[PDB]
Design a binder for these strands. Structure first.
Lengths: 385, 137, 267, 173, 125, 125
RNA sequence: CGUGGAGGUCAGUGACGAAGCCUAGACCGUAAGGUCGGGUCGAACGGCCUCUAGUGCAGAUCUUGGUGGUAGUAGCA
RNA sequence: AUAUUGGCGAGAGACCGAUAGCGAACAAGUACAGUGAUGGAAAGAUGAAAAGAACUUUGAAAAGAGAGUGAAAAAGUACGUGAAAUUGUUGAAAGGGAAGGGCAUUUGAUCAGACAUGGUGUUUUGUGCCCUCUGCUCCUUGUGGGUAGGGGAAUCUCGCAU
């Protein structure tokens, strides 16, 4: 298989070329064919988010402010074909550090309070992408006909943002949120100039202590709209979310503004992140943007990560479905992804790439990279002779 | 410091216990080179072991004046066991890689064993004597 | 049948030592005539210690750790409601660390509220010592911007040196592991980068296991290929934990007892 | 009746008593006002019995009528007690109309303490504490003792410094 | 609950019967369960264990490791699985004594009487 | 609690006669039964005997120096019997309770305002 | 007040360390003794209402086992 | 129908738990003693698995030292826990032909000694189980309980957060 491992300590892309059963930790085990550092731009300009477009084209987003379109090209160097990376276009200066440094007068805990990209995805065969920052900015960067990136419109949102998820289930709409920021649904116009907040979430009733329940949603995934008689005025958007306070929260807009079920996944309000969607049998059940393709919450199965060392699995009702790689993962997990519905991509602060099988909960690939990973994408899984 | 130490031990040794106690404390706190030379002199009746606790009917000699005791004896067998251990502890020190010249017995200890017989355990721990120092204004 | 067993194996142990060493006395006698025969024994027959059987960038240097550009100011605090031994311990860190200020910590100012002060006052590192009972137990080094943070455990402190006002020279041992050299990185940063050669003071940070020992010494050079050294300063043992990555929010290693099971690895 | 219930649990077993070293007796039947147990201060012996409890933050006052001696399923009738202290003590009073002055001020007293148990929130808003209790399991107490003593022995710190001073000041001559 | 008067619930009698059991009774006492795949195929829960059949270890330090049984040590109530071996300090190899309740059979060794044993217990080879 | 000044009458332990001379004779109190014993006939100079006069004041009996009565506690259920007697009684976490359960007990007793006589038992930081 | 076992109960305690053993450690009980901290340990155990007995030791030129002073003494023909 | 400390074979116990229980839980009517008839003990427990300490080194041997296995050798075929008498070493103290004890105190050594932090009365706001609009549901007597969708603070301390 072939991977694009985003490195931060060097500020680059390391390219993993290997087979299934590759283990760098054991010397007598299988080795990866080629490791390849590309575009080393220092710690100050590390890659936040990516998107693989096709066989020979992939977009990037760096923490210096730069969104870059990069051309992939293959050549020879047994019988393996390494990749070359060349920056064609670059749209820069897309962060606003002034907003975030002014707002968080001790929000929770961050001294530097760096603005990064929260998403990088396509709007629709479009050549049209979106990119959102933590300071409430949204940039509609469209790739031109001459293969050059141009910014159509910069848009404003209520800070601070942490996740932003588009809705690609026809049956433009998106949702976003962050620390003491509720989940708000915003409709975009086809001109990409107008944004309209059509809906806002409500926080649940108080706990035992009559304290206000903390609100910090970390990721959202959409479901296909609720069946039956659609009420007038009330919109039809089924979706779930994960907070930093262990709350797997599930929203049906047809039901109401308050989520119908908030579920504490772990005790002691352990911080959680990155809501992925998988299926128990190792199948593809999602769109290109990871949104679950069903009309019920009970079919949903989720993978989420804490900040201690663990990767968890949960169903639609908060029942614990087993940890992922309890033995091998010694550090945290910065990034997880369910690729193809039958593979898991994982790599955190312990500085190892891990590829887990979904069905058997078995680790396939372990690759030492020497740098903190924040992003992984699989290009292909065709074997090398 | 265990890094600056070597230790020999003999167990269940068929020696007289009461004689071993005297020849152990006679050699306690001494430099290794002076210690081994002393026991050679005890074997050849040049010097005698000062007997202090278990010392009934010991013949009074002039050689005890070194230690401020009237009574003293030449116990060949007990000393033979002790210098065997000291030779062993010397090789234990050179196994670790200690200095031979600055070596001295710090802790030598002897206690009774299971019995009639009257056997005895001996253990001795040799140590470096570390000086080596300077200053600056 | 203990009474049978006792005699049988005592005699077997007695039989084995005779046979073991009669073999060796013959070994000694053949070695006197031929030195070469001994050489081949040492090749095949190996001592097989634990160390032998172990089960196997520049931008960073400045951004996460303090370099030779400024004097690093270290905000030495103590865990709330601590007693004599903690301040007694602070007096040992008052000498060894470069530019320490002791801050009496008076309840509240949670952690981020501290960070606000040491941004304004412009400190580099925070160090906090804690006590469960009358003994000192844990030591926490944090870097004030960004927040690479290291936690430690002390199980040894024993107290004839009495040092000068001269600044000690650093030395580190066994940090092959990358997690080891990121801790080696901390002690390169947090301790002074001055070394004044004269005054002859050396601070070590030996790490042959996962245990790190720091000591001070006085080195005297004789021209016959040897150096002498006297014990000085505090006796010490540390254990790495956590690597919290943010100020306190994230982890990188966090010791569990799920290790010690390997008997090897050593991070 | 109830006098026959009392004498049979006063001695001859109330199988939820705690004999404190003070000689004191404590009924742990979740529905008693005084944690101590005495005649008509424990909820089994008495037939008319009031109590304040909490299931969530909602402080209910349970009430036991002798009407329901037949049916233990619905013995304790319960009423929510607003949330403000002043109106709640007034809320209490009306329920306790024409009862013993025991339950009158003692449910008032239960409510008082259980409301100042909601000093939990005070401890849990201004928490942010950098300590947390850690167990010291005696296996770990020797994995981190007998391996340090084995570390120092194999360490040979003196020889390590003696090497890396000569190896330094030969190269830095 | 015990209903029969023939069977004894005494600890002393039961422990003696087990430790002084003959080799033939110890064959039945050293039974292993079959994996869910073989249970689906053959329609049987558990069988006595032999040599030339494969096995997967479920419980213990050697968790998840598999292999093929070398020798049923009936005296020590143990199996010795090949390639599940503890390496001694002299470089030699010594097999770990596993117990067949902790094991799970993955691939049986079908003989004639073994086929008859499956057919007796309600099987379908 | 505003308590009276706790008088003890006899702070010293009532040891046995010849408990110090002989080793087989325990320090646990036993009366001297012999008619010719000086301790029994209470001669001057000899050891003081335990008698009813040394009995503690009823109002200040069983009270620790803090002014609380001691009370053993096994779990959170037994702890919550003292919801009404925080000023009078004090939670003594029993010796055999694990370190895993004590962190739970100490959390609740801190919230209820119950003074625990033995915190920091098995619990480091 | 304490010990071995029995019935009942505490949805008791317990490999996150039961029982035992120590401890220049602390508290309670006039006391018999009870409770707790620390150290050592490795698998069961305790409070409460009752039952039952081969139930509580300083002695008996007590029985058994172990260990001293005598003593490196008399002694080895 | 009745007897039964033997034999053969079971089922049990408010029994004993290794100085007990049969003399014997083990090379027990054995070792051994007596001319002989006979008399007749002591002695259980490494671990989960021997993984029973390879290999270097000290000694003719007896035992040690490095090093390692194991969760633990702080479990070594002297092997679970390891008490007291008693013995050595080290440290502290005392000692002019007696010590130990009781009452009281000094000196020396030493251990305890809050993850205690508020309480009350006003004032910004912001939320909710608060006001208000619309409900739904368990049951028993009014003095009920649980639980949704919206709105709203310009009234309201009703509670909790700042």
């Amino acid at each position: 298989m072939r991977l694009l491992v985003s490195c931060v300590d060097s500020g680059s892309i390391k390219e993993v070329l290997c087979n299934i059963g590759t283990d760098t930790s054991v010397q007598s085990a299988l080795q990866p064919f080629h490791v390849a550092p590309h575009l080393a731009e220092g710690l100050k300009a590390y890659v936040d988010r990516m998107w693989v477009i096709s066989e020979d084209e992939a977009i990037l987003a760096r923490n210096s402010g730069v969104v870059e379109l990069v051309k992939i090209s293959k050549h020879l160097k047994p019988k393996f074909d390494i990749s070359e990376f060349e920056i064609t276009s670059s749209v820069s200066d897309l962060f606003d550090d002034a907003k975030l440094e002014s707002l968080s007068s001790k929000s929770v805990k961050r001294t530097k309070l760096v603005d990064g990209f929260v998403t990088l995805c396509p709007i629709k065969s479009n050549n049209t992408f979106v990119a959102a920052t933590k300071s409430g900015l949204l940039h509609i960067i469209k790739k031109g006909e001459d293969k050059k990136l141009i910014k159509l419109a910069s848009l404003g949102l209520k800070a601070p943002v942490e996740f932003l998820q588009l809705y690609d289930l026809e049956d433009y709409i998106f949702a976003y949120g962050g620390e003491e920021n509720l989940i708000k649904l915003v409709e975009i116009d086809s001109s990409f100039q107008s944004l309209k907040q059509i809906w806002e979430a409500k926080n649940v009733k108080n706990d035992r202590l009559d304290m206000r329940v903390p609100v910090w949603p970390m990721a959202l995934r959409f479901l296909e709209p609720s069946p039956g008689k659609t009420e007038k005025g009330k919109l039809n958007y089924q979706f779930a979310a994960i907070t930093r306070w262990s709350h797997l929260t599930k929203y049906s807009t047809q039901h109401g503004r308050k989520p119908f079920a908030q579920i504490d996944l772990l005790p002691n309000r352990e911080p959680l992140s990155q809501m992925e969607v998988f299926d128990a049998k190792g199948e593809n059940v999602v769109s290109s943007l990871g949104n679950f393709q069903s009309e019920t919450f009970n079919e949903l199965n989720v993978i989420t990560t804490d900040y201690k060392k663990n990767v968890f699995k949960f169903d639609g009702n908060g029942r614990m479905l087993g940890k992922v790689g309890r033995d091998d993962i010694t550090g945290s997990s910065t990034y997880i992804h369910v690729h193809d519905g039958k593979y898991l991509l994982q790599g955190g602060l312990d500085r190892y790439v891990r590829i887990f099988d979904i069905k058997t909960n078995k680790m396939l690939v372990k690759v030492y990279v020497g740098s903190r990973i924040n992003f992984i994408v699989m290009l292909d899984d065709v074997e090398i002779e | 410091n265990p890094a600056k130490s070597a230790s020999a031990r003999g167990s269940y040794l068929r020696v007289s216990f009461k004689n071993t106690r005297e020849t152990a404390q006679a050699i306690n706190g001494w430099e290794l080179t002076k210690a081994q030379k002393y026991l050679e002199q005890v074997l050849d009746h040049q010097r005698a072991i000062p007997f202090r606790r278990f010392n009934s009917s010991i013949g009074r000699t002039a050689q005890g004046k070194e230690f401020g005791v009237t009574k003293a004896r030449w116990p060949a067998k007990s000393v033979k066991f002790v210098q065997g251990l000291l030779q062993n502890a010397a090789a234990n020190a050179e196994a670790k890689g200690l200095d031979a010249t600055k070596l001295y017995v710090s802790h030598i200890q002897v206690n009774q064993a299971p019995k009639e017989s009257s056997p005895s355990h001996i253990e001795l721990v040799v140590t470096e004597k570390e000086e080596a120092v300077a200053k600056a204004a | 049948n203990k009474l049978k067993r006792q005699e049988i194996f005592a005699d077997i142990k007695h039989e084995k030592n005779k046979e073991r060493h009669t073999m060796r006395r013959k070994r000694a006698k053949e070695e006197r005539e031929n030195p070469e025969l001994r050489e081949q024994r040492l090749k095949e027959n190996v001592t097989q210690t634990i160390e032998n059987t172990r089960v196997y960038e520049d931008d960073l240097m400045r951004y996460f750790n303090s370099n030779s550009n400024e004097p690093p100011k270290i905000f030495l605090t103590t865990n709330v409601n601590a007693k004599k031994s903690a301040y007694e311990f602070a007096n040992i860190l008052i000498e060894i660390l470069p530019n320490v200020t002791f801050v009496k910590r008076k309840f509240g100012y949670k952690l981020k509220e501290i960070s606000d002060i040491c941004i304004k006052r412009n400190f580099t590192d925070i160090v906090i010592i804690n006590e469960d009972k009358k003994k000192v137990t844990g030591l926490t080094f944090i870097h004030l911007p960004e927040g690479p943070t290291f936690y430690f455990k002390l199980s040894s402190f024993v107290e004839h040196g009495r040092p000068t006002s001269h600044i000690p020279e650093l030395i580190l041992n066994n940090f092959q592991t990358r997690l080891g050299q990121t801790v080696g990185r901390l002690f390169q940063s947090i301790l002074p980068q001055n070394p004044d050669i004269e005054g002859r003071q050396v601070i070590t940070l030996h790490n042959q296991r996962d245990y790190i020992f720091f000591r001070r010494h006085r080195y005297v050079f004789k021209d016959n290929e040897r150096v002498g050294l006297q014990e000085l300063g505090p006796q010490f043992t540390l254990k790495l934990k956590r690597l919290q990555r943010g100020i306190k929010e994230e982890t990188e290693w966090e010791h569990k007892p799920e290790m010690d099971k390997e008997k090897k690895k050593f991070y | 009746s109830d006098e026959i219930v009392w004498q049979v649990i006063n001695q001859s077993f109330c199988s939820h008593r705690i004999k404190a070293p003070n000689g004191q007796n404590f009924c742990r039947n979740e529905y008693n006002v005084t944690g101590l147990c005495t005649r008509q201060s424990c909820p089994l012996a008495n037939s008319k019995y009031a109590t304040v409890k909490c299931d969530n933050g909602k402080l209910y006052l349970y009430m036991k009528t002798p009407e329901r001696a037949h049916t233990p399923a619905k013995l304790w009738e319960r009423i929510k007690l607003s949330k403000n202290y002043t109106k709640a003590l007034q809320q209490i009073d009306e329920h306790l109309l024409h009862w013993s002055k025991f339950f009158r001020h003692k449910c008032k007293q239960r409510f008082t303490k259980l409301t100042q148990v909601m000093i939990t929130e005070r401890r849990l808003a201004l928490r942010e504490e950098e300590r947390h209790y850690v167990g010291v399991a005696p296996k770990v107490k020797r994995r981190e003792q007998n391996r340090e003593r084995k570390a120092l022995v194999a360490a040979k710190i003196e020889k390590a410094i003696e090497k890396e001073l000569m190896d330094r000041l030969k190269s830095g001559a | 609950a015990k209903q029969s008067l023939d069977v004894s619930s005494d600890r002393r009698k039961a422990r003696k019967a087990y430790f002084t059991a003959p080799s033939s009774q110890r064959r039945v006492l050293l039974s292993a369960p079959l994996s869910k795949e073989l249970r689906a195929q053959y329609g049987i829960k558990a069988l006595p264990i032999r040599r030339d059949d494969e096995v997967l270890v479920v419980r213990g330090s050697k968790k998840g490791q598999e292999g093929k049984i070398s020798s049923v040590y009936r005296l020590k109530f143990a199996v010795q699985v090949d390639k599940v071996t503890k390496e001694k300090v002299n470089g030699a190899s010594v097999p770990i004594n596993l117990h067949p309740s902790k094991l799970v059979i993955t691939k049986l060794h079908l003989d004639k009487d073994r086929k008859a044993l499956i057919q007796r217990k309600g099987g379908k080879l | 609690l505003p308590h009276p000044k706790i008088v003890k009458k006899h702070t010293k332990k009532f040891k046995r006669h010849h408990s110090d001379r002989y080793h087989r004779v325990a320090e646990n109190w036993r009366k001297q039964k012999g008619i010719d014993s000086v301790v029994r006939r209470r001669f001057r100079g000899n050891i003081s005997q335990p008698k009813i006069g040394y009995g503690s004041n009823k109002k200040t009996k069983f009270l620790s120096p803090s002014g609380h009565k001691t009370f053993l506690v096994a779990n959170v259920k037994d702890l919550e019997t003292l919801t009404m007697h925080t000023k009078t009684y004090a939670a003594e976490i029993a010796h055999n309770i694990s370190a895993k359960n004590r962190v739970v007990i100490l959390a609740r007793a801190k919230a209820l305002g119950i003074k625990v006589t033995n915190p920091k038992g098995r619990l480091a930081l």
